[PDB]
Write a protein that binds this ligand. Structure first.
Ligand SMILES: CCCCCCCCCCCCCCCCCC(=O)OC[C@H](COP(=O)([O-])OCC(O)COP(=O)([O-])OC[C@@H](COC(=O)CCCCCCCCCCCCCCCCC)OC(=O)CCCCCCCCCCCCCCCCC)OC(=O)CCCCCCCCCCCCCCCCC
Ligand SMILES: CCCCCCCCCCCCCCCCCC(=O)OC[C@H](COP(=O)([O-])OCC[N+](C)(C)C)OC(=O)CCCCCCCCCCCCCCCCC
Ligand SMILES: CCCCCCCCCCCCCCCCCC(=O)OC[C@H](COP(=O)(O)OCCN)OC(=O)CCCCCCCCCCCCCCCCC
Ligand SMILES: CCCCCCCCCCCCCCCCCC(=O)OC[C@H](COP(=O)(O)OCCN)OC(=O)CCCCCCCCCCCCCCCCC
Ligand SMILES: CCCCCCCCCCCCCCCCCC(=O)OC[C@H](COP(=O)(O)OCCN)OC(=O)CCCCCCCCCCCCCCCCC
Ligand SMILES: C[C@H](CCC(=O)O)[C@H]1CC[C@H]2[C@@H]3[C@H](O)C[C@@H]4C[C@H](O)CC[C@]4(C)[C@H]3C[C@H](O)[C@]12C
Lengths: 171, 547, 57, 90, 127, 459, 88, 173
């Protein structure tokens, strides 16, 4: 899905990046970029949805034979050089529950704060369980979204892992 | 004899001690990388002392200290051979590794497993000196498969990445396919002769040795990434750049050639193999260099530069010039290590960016790195009286003026031209033109370690070739009489390569759209060999399995 | 430390060490039944020493 | 039921849930296993008195090779058993 | 610019996929339906995944089925199926027959040469 | 041999009479001591074997298999005590008794001087083996796979009995030493061909040969850790040891009656090594590795050359230590995630650093990294089969290439990648688990320093 | 990696800095909460080009799906902080 | 290793050129050689003397075993195990010794190859000549017997060779 509105927009970003790879130098890219913009704005006012789709059919087909064989990919993005590079250093937080007490003495203050955070999760869970139950449309939720908290001092449902996920560059 | 034999083995035992102190003792953690760097620092100097003795009087040793196993009429000993190839190579490998062990202290400072990384770098070096000094084929295998493992463990250094794990398994798969040739030679010599020792092999000199040499050549095809088994060397750039510099460009990849340089006494008689090694080298030097032009990642380009050169070593083997290929290996190590180390400075300054398209305008922002990136690049192409000149020039002279395959003679020269084209592309895109990297500028190379490491190998890329070429004893009848054009064919094509390259770069400035040429797409996608073969073969073997 | 209750605990540890002694002793006892060719083999036949009963036992 | 042995005891070696036994079980394994059977077992095998006469054979051949070289006899003869003793058919 | 010619190992891109262009009420419902099942599963997993008291494994029933189906013995199949079972018979006793003559003839030739002295075994001492 | 049989018997009174809490400490500490005295069996002479009595002898082929057997018992006690902590004491003691009973039959099996005494003890082993695998086996899944025994007994153990009895009436003795000096050539004949199959089919199934291998993966999935350790380490070797002994009296028929079996093993190596790649269960992947490794041993035995026999003996000992080490490593995970699926837990090197090292060493020796005895064995088998026919280097080479793939594919899948998020019970490795691996790989690596002891009687 | 630290304030400046240099937009109208479709009145297309610019300022791709949901500068700033875990 | 019996393990006399330095620059190797002798050769040599003095204080001897020749399998009655056992163990000892003979003649062939450097293909004709004879004698004695080799099989191979050799001689006449 994504509707003809989004589907066309994505092509714009994807087509631009490939162009940026092909032309290499910024100046040539900028000039050749503006030409690209013109082709997009030309049919931006087409009010025939049936015709609008046909523009996309040929538009993508044109792109398929314009794509740079090696398009530039951001280093830390999927398919990039550094993608998943640091996943070895990311250790999930629950591993700290197994530390030897002698080790935990080395970091007293942090572990003390951890106990506070753990207590928050345990108490909030029962409340968090209810909130999803009542809002849930019988027959299973139809979408993957979640509802924000509806009371003071109540945390949004299912917040532990999003909050405590390992940092981007742990070490 | 006393000094030669004793100090030949202190080097090997000196490198192991840092490994031994990891398993026991507790005198110094935290400072392990500098402890290792000093071991190679001292192991080099101790390795020079035997080298000077070899230069002075051509002294050569075999040391078979330990008797390990006697399989009836087959006796296996821990035999080290300190001859022409061992004595020259060890200081070169130690000198190159010395700087890298110092460039890794900077390039890998943040990584918390820094001590583990230095343990693996040293464990490779130990398995490489074993490979070169080995005197019998079985001991050669320990080094042969010792390096193969240490590639797996280092290529997949960042084991979270799924591409790193794929690239490591790919390295193993191609080498072990080549190591079918190694065992075939091992089986043949035991069956037809009676030893895995090299001495007895050369003494008997089998006249009909087509089968064992095919097996030996097949090992070089896989280990040194020749055509048919080459995709792993590009894909093995997934490891940390110090790994790619020390292993997959300076040393480890030469072991495939080093195996054939060991067996020149047999290959010299066998013409039928000489053709194959010449043809095998001829295609690989062209193909990889042809692929090098259209690449966009600095590591990948320098990776194909290694393969294209390695093929030139394989051609030298074919034209029956084994001692030059050895010289090319030693001279090649210096500037190819410097290239990678310099490309390490760019990547580290630009926040882990390997695409040259997003590099530029560094010619003034990084003086020291830029100077070396020029010095190294000039050596590769064939700048007169640089380290690369003393080896590459003669190889072209001996190829032109020898009974050879016509197409192989032609492909070598074409590839030498291409070596000029992508020597510039690194310079033009990475050093010249207005900057193209992200806004926030953090380009800073003012660190003693990165500088001292680059400085040392920079000297090697200048004077190492001149010293080595002069000192080493004469071993063949060099050809110095030839038509003028054949004499300077190397320089002309290098010059003709530059002219075409600079014109191509300028055309990139001109505001004209990009037009896809089939020749262009074939270049960029590596000829589709990686795509077709890493999809058809895995699919068939995995799918056939269930039946 | 009292001998009893120290012996009520570790008396089981002697079973296997004793078993070795019993097995070793019986393995010596079985050689004696195979002394038919003692000092009569062509390869090791020799005269005895003045104070030696037999070549081996 | 998957009871973490560490929870009840933070120094458990994994052998038992009884702390007293747990420490002893480790000591015999580490003592008998490593101190005795591997360290001394290695020393025993290292100094095995001439395994399968490999050393003796080399001394014997040296004595034979010396003798046969001086007196003019061949180092090794093709026929293992003296042809006089054999009696071929027919 | 010829369209993309798909193959087993060369998937047809979504952008050039003919179907994706026209999504009607029928298609819209299906994708919403799929999302419905997907949404429900995500809910079941997330309750156990985020449960503070869980120290264990969230046994995935789908995984179990995959392992069970892969690790099958004899409950399927019929013995005298010519189209498939015979094709299995060839792929099994087929290669064993091929390598038989590949190794039988070679050892026959070698023995005959050795029985005639033609084969050279001057130093062949280890076997 | 009584110096070993008796103290092994005294382990049963030791287990029963010990303090309830000290059974594991006593049995492990005293089963370790028995193994120490088993290094006296390396009193080997160049010309003659070490013959103790009319019943038992010990030559170079049985000495390692005996030392491996008695080294394994203390390991099998350490491996099993964790999952036997729940069950009551009397059931606990019987489990240890069955293991002590198995060792007692195995030490007598490898040293039996007469072939009927070997045969009877060769089948008596299955009694403790099946009780351990079915009574304490983790799987109550109901196989109906007894047909594999009905196939085995009808096609294996029974013909071995009728042939062994037939041979004694003809030769007059089954003493192994006597058969060395009284053996006569086996003339071609349809009656002799049946004698050859009778004397070998019993051992081929246990190896197992390709085509007869399907029982092994199933047995490993059912068995507890102790069952798999003894099964892979030793019981597979009883077939190998059986064929090395019994091929003495089968010549020259082995020259032409071994062609069909070599083609199964040579082609069997590739088929099972490839199947390892597509396996989803660790224990099945390791179980199919054994069939691929033992396929070399079958080829080595049947080509009967001095180099092959040294190769088979090194492989049998080397494979035993390696495969049991892999089975233990697989069990360490199962004792956590509580599943035998390989894909379930991934990236475990992030949570268990040292355990990932043991996995690496176990994988390296399985893929045969020089100079490990895993390669000393494999290389010798490859050298000799090359002489048998140069073409075999093709099949031997491909098997080396595939073997490195499942060896490391197993390493990559379980120890590398992103950890499974929802698995939060990966507690740190116990000293029991680390000591257990170290007792598989420290002896295995030290054997490279003195490899002659494992190279058999052809050395 | 030397020290490329990022803080919310610094990120905010850079995001605005890039926004100001876009000619279609005015410097003074721009503010942290300036909805692109309304307060600055820009096409949806122009919204794409703003995103592509921001990727290059910080050199890390913003997924297509999440780019759409960004429609004001204050949205972008907090998105960066989330991905790069900027807390103070 | 009392000292490698020079006859068994021969080495030709050493001919080393005398130092003839024409140039005026210092020669580092000469300097290092003296430093090595002081720093390494002597302190080690002192250690070996301290050990050697104590070794000679306690001197005890070990001997090389002697085996009487006994009747060969050719003199053994069929199936007479006690005769075959004596004959069989003796043959195994000689099969083992003859293996170490081939190794000695192999060790020579490998020492000559290294010692004679680049001229080895000429100056090792005798070493190659001796190595080919021992190999041929060994091949005829012990090759093809199999893993279950025995004196009875060694005899059968010999008796097969003599028949074919005997028969051949007739055909010439
Ligand atoms: C062998 C070389 C291994 C080098 C090594 O240490 O790497 C292990 C290393 C483990 O460490 P790691 O995983 O890298 O990272 C550190 C770990 O987290 C944990 O390591 P760590 O550094 O943090 O802790 C110290 C270290 C060690 O911890 C210890 O304390 C070691 C104690 C156990 C050693 C006992 C050996 C002695 C055995 C007893 C019997 C002999 C003594 C008796 C004699 C008495 C006197 C006569 O830990 C370990 O390495 C764990 C494994 C140790 C046992 C491995 C088996 C040896 O893994 C590897 O590197 C794999 C090796 C890859 C192949 C390299 C070799 C290929 C070429 C073959 C060379 C062949 C040479 C021989 C022929 C000539
Ligand atoms: C560079 C690194 C440092 C150099 C280190 C090398 C020097 C180390 C010392 C050395 O070489 O060792 C000497 C010896 C080998 O060298 P050697 O054969 O020359 O003997 C040395 C002694 N002399 C000179 C007198 C002969 O080491 C060993 O023999 C160790 C044997 C270990 C094998 C036994 C394992 C233990 C068995 C117990 C049971 C466990 C196994 C269970 C059963 C398994 C199935 C069989
Ligand atoms: C590899 C190098 C180590 C070799 C070694 O382990 O020593 C063995 C050697 C025995 O001599 P060898 O004739 O070769 O016996 C072979 C039987 N396998 O041993 C020797 O011959 C000499 C051993 C004594 C070394 C004296 C120096 C000791 C230095 C202090 C210890 C550090
Ligand atoms: C096989 C040869 C033995 C045949 C005997 C079969 C019957 C044995 C039997 O079933 O006894 C079961 C008995 C269970 O009784 P339980 O409640 O555990 O009593 C405490 C145990 N100490 O537990 C027992 O079996 C206790 C007896 C164990 C046998 C060893 C006792 C050691 C001392 C005598 C050696 C007997 C050797 C047999
Ligand atoms: C069912 C019966 C199978 C045929 C068995 C048979 O008939 O044996 C014949 C043979 C008789 O010969 P015999 O009297 O001993 O000596 C005089 C020489 N004619 O008997 C013999 O001489 C030797 C008998 C050997 C033992 C026979 C064991 C019966 C099973 C034979 C098949 C084994 C293979 C099973 C299938 C394996 C998978 C292919
Ligand atoms: C021998 C000594 C142990 C006594 C002590 O604890 O001081 C230990 C302590 C720290 C060690 C040092 C550190 O490991 C590193 C030092 C710096 C250089 O790498 C040279 C070796 C170097 C000089 C080492 C030599 C030696 O191993 C040292 C000096």
């Amino acid at each position: 899905y994504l509707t003809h509105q989004q589907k066309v927009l994505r092509l714009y970003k994807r087509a631009l990046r490939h162009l940026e790879s092909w032309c290499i130098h910024r100046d040539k890219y900028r000039y050749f970029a503006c030409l690209l913009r013109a082709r997009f704005d030309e049919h931006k006012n087409e009010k025939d949805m049936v015709k609008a789709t046909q523009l996309l059919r040929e538009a993508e087909e044109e792109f398929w034979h314009g794509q740079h064989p090696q398009p530039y990919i951001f280093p830390e993005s999927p398919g990039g050089t550094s993608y998943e590079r640091y996943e070895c250093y990311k250790v999930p937080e629950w591993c700290l529950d197994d530390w030897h007490p002698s080790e935990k003495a080395m970091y007293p203050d942090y572990f003390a704060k951890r106990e506070q955070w753990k207590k928050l999760r345990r108490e909030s869970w029962e409340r968090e369980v209810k909130q999803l139950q009542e809002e849930t449309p019988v027959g299973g939720p139809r979408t993957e979204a979640l509802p924000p908290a509806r009371k003071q001092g109540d945390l949004p449902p299912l917040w532990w892992h999003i909050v405590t996920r390992p940092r981007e560059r742990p070490m | 004899m006393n000094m030669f034999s004793s100090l030949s083995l202190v080097t090997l035992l000196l490198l192991t001690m840092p490994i031994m102190m990891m398993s026991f003792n507790t005198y110094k953690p935290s400072n392990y990388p500098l402890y290792v760097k000093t071991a190679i620092s001292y192991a080099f100097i101790t390795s020079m002392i035997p080298t000077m003795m070899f230069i002075h009087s051509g002294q050569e040793l075999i040391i078979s200290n330990w008797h390990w196993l006697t399989i009836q009429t087959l006796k296996l000993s821990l035999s080290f051979k300190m001859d022409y190839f061992s004595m020259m190579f060890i200081p070169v490998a130690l000198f190159v590794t010395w700087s890298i062990m110092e460039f890794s202290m900077w390039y890998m400072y943040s990584d918390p497993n820094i001590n583990k990384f230095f343990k693996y770098l040293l464990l490779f070096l130990i398995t490489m000196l074993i490979l070169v000094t080995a005197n019998n084929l079985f001991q050669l295998f320990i080094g042969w498969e010792g390096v193969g493992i240490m590639s797996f463990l280092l290529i997949g250094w960042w084991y979270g990445r799924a591409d790193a794990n794929t690239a490591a398994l790919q390295a193993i798969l191609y080498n072990r396919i080549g190591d079918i040739g190694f065992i075939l030679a091992m089986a043949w010599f035991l069956t037809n002769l009676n030893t895995w020792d090299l001495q007895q092999i050369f003494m008997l000199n089998p006249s009909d040795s087509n089968m064992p040499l095919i097996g030996l050549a097949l090992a070089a095809t896989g280990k040194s990434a020749q055509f048919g088994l080459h995709p792993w060397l590009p894909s093995a750039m997934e490891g940390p750049t110090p790994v790619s510099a020390l292993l997959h460009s300076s040393t480890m990849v030469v072991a495939g050639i080093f195996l054939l340089i060991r067996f020149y006494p047999l290959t010299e008689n066998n013409k039928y193999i000489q053709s194959i090694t010449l043809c095998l080298g001829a295609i690989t030097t062209l193909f990889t260099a042809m692929c090098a032009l259209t690449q966009n990642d600095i590591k990948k380009i320098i990776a194909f530069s290694t393969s294209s050169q390695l093929g030139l070593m394989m051609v030298t083997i074919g034209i029956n010039q084994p001692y030059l290929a050895f010289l090319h290996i030693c001279t090649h190590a210096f500037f190819k290590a410097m290239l990678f180390m310099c490309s390490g400075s760019i990547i580290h300054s630009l926040n882990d960016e390997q695409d040259i398209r997003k590099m530029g305008g560094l010619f003034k922002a990084m003086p020291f790195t830029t100077t070396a990136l020029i010095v190294g690049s000039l050596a590769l192409t064939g700048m007169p009286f640089l380290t690369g000149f003393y080896s590459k020039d003669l190889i072209i002279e001996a190829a032109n003026t020898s009974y050879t395959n016509a197409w192989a003679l032609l492909m070598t020269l074409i590839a030498t031209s291409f070596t000029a084209i992508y020597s510039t592309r690194i310079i033009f895109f990475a050093l010249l033109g207005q900057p193209r990297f992200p806004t926030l500028v953090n380009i800073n190379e003012n660190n003693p370690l990165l500088i001292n490491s680059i400085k040392r190998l920079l000297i090697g890329s200048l004077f190492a070739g001149y010293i080595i070429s002069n000192n080493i004893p004469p071993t063949t009848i060099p050809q110095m009489t030839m038509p003028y054009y054949l004499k300077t064919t190397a320089l002309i094509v290098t010059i003709l390569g530059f002219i075409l390259a600079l014109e191509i770069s300028n055309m990139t400035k001109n505001l004209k759209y990009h037009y896809p040429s089939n020749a262009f797409k074939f270049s960029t996608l590596l000829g589709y060999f990686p795509t077709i073969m890493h999809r058809l073969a895995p699919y068939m073997n995995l799918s056939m399995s269930q039946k | 430390m009292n001998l009893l209750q120290v012996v009520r605990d570790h008396w089981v540890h002697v079973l296997v060490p004793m078993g070795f002694v019993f097995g070793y002793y019986l393995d010596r006892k079985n050689d004696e039944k195979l002394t038919a060719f003692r000092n009569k083999s062509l390869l090791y036949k020799r005269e005895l020493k003045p104070n030696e009963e037999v070549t081996w036992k | 039921e998957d009871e973490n042995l560490y929870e009840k005891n933070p120094d458990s070696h994994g052998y038992d849930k009884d702390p007293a036994v747990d420490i002893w079980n480790m000591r015999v394994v580490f003592f008998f296993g490593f101190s005795i059977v591997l360290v001394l077992g290695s020393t025993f095998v290292a100094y095995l008195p001439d395994y399968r006469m490999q050393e003796w054979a080399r001394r014997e051949a040296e004595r034979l090779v010396k003798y046969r070289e001086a007196h003019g006899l061949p180092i090794m003869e093709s026929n293992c058993f003296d042809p006089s003793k054999i009696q071929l058919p027919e | 610019f010829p369209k993309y010619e798909a193959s087993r190992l060369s998937s047809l891109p979504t952008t050039l996929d003919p179907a994706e262009y026209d999504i009607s009420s029928e298609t819209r419902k299906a994708q919403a339906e799929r999302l419905a099942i997907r949404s429900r599963l995500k809910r079941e997993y997330q309750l156990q995944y985020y449960d503070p008291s869980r120290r264990g494994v969230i046994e995935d029933p789908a995984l179990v089925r995959w392992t069970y189906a892969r690790s099958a013995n004899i409950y399927p199949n019929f013995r005298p199926n010519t189209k498939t079972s015979l094709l299995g018979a060839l792929f099994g006793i087929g290669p064993l027959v091929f390598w038989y003559y590949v190794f039988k003839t070679d050892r026959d030739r070698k023995e005959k040469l050795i029985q005639e002295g033609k084969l050279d075994r001057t130093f062949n001492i280890s076997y | 041999m009584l110096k070993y049989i008796i103290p092994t018997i005294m382990l049963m009174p030791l287990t029963w009479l010990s303090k309830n809490n000290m059974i594991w400490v006593n049995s492990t500490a005293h089963s370790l001591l028995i193994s120490f005295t088993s290094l006296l069996l390396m009193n080997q002479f160049g010309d003659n074997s070490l013959n103790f009595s009319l019943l038992f002898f010990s030559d170079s082929l049985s000495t390692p298999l005996l030392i491996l057997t008695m080294w394994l018992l203390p390991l099998m006690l350490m491996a099993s005590q964790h999952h036997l902590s729940k069950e009551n004491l009397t059931r606990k003691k019987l489990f240890i008794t069955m293991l002590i009973s198995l060792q007692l039959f195995l030490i007598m099996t490898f040293t039996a001087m007469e072939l009927i005494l070997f045969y009877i003890l060769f089948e008596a082993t299955l009694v403790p083996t099946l009780i351990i695998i079915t009574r304490w086996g983790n799987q109550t899944e109901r196989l109906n796979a007894g047909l594999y025994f009905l196939f085995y007994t009808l096609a294996g153990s029974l013909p071995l009995l009728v042939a062994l009895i037939y041979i004694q009436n003809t030769v007059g003795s089954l003493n192994f030493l006597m058969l060395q000096y009284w053996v006569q050539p086996v003339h071609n004949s349809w009656s002799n061909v049946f004698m050859w199959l009778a004397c070998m089919m019993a051992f081929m199934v246990k190896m197992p040969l390709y085509g007869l291998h399907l029982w092994l993966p199933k047995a490993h999935v059912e068995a507890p850790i102790a069952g798999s350790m003894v099964l892979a380490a030793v019981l597979l070797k009883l077939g190998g040891y059986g064929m090395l002994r019994i091929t003495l009296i089968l010549n020259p028929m082995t020259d032409f009656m071994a062609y069909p079996f070599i083609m199964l093993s040579l082609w069997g190596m590739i088929m099972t090594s490839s199947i390892c790649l597509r396996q989803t269960d660790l224990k099945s992947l390791i179980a199919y590795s054994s069939v691929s490794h033992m396929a070399l041993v079958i080829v080595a035995i049947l080509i009967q050359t001095p180099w092959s026999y040294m190769g088979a003996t090194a492989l049998m000992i080397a494979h035993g230590l390696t495969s049991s080490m892999l089975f233990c490593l697989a069990n360490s995970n199962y004792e956590r995630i509580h599943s035998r699926t390989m894909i379930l837990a991934r990236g475990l090197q992030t949570l268990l650093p040292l355990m990932a090292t043991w996995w690496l060493l176990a994988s390296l020796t399985n893929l045969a990294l020089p100079p490990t005895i895993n390669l000393i064995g494999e290389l010798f088998v490859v050298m000799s089969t090359f002489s048998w026919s140069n073409i075999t280097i093709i099949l031997m080479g491909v098997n080396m290439v595939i073997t490195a793939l499942y060896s490391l594919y197993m390493l990559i899948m379980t120890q590398r990648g992103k950890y499974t998020y929802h698995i939060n019970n990966i507690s740190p490795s116990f000293t029991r688990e680390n000591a257990l691996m170290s007792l598989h790989i420290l002896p295995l690596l030290l054997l490279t320093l003195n490899p002659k002891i494992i190279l058999g009687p052809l050395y | 990696s030397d020290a490329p630290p990022l803080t919310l304030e610094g990120i905010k400046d850079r995001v605005l800095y890039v926004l100001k240099l876009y000619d279609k937009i005015d410097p003074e109208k721009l503010s942290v909460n300036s909805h692109f479709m309304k307060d600055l009145g820009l096409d949806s297309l122009d919204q794409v080009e703003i995103i592509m610019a921001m990727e290059d300022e910080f050199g890390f791709e913003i997924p297509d799906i999440d780019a759409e949901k960004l429609m004001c500068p204050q949205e972008i700033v907090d998105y960066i902080a989330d991905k790069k875990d900027v807390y103070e | 290793p009392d000292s490698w019996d020079k006859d068994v393990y021969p080495e030709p006399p050493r001919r080393t050129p005398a130092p003839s330095p024409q140039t005026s620059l210092p020669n580092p190797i000469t300097y290092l050689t003296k430093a090595f002798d002081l720093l390494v050769d002597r302190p080690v040599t002192l250690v070996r003397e301290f050990i050697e003095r104590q070794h000679a204080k306690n001197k005890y001897y070990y001997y090389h075993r002697e085996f009487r020749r006994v009747p060969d399998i050719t003199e053994c009655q069929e199936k007479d195990v006690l005769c075959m056992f004596e004959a069989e163990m003796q043959w195994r000892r000689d099969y083992k010794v003859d293996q170490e003979i081939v190794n000695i003649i192999q060790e020579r062939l490998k020492a000559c190859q290294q010692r004679e450097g680049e001229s080895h293909r000429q100056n090792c004709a005798k070493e190659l000549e001796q190595f080919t004879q021992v190999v041929k004698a060994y091949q005829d004695r012990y090759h093809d017997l199999g893993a279950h080799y025995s004196a009875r099989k060694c005899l059968a191979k010999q008796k097969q060779r003599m028949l074919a050799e005997r028969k051949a001689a007739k055909e010439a006449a």
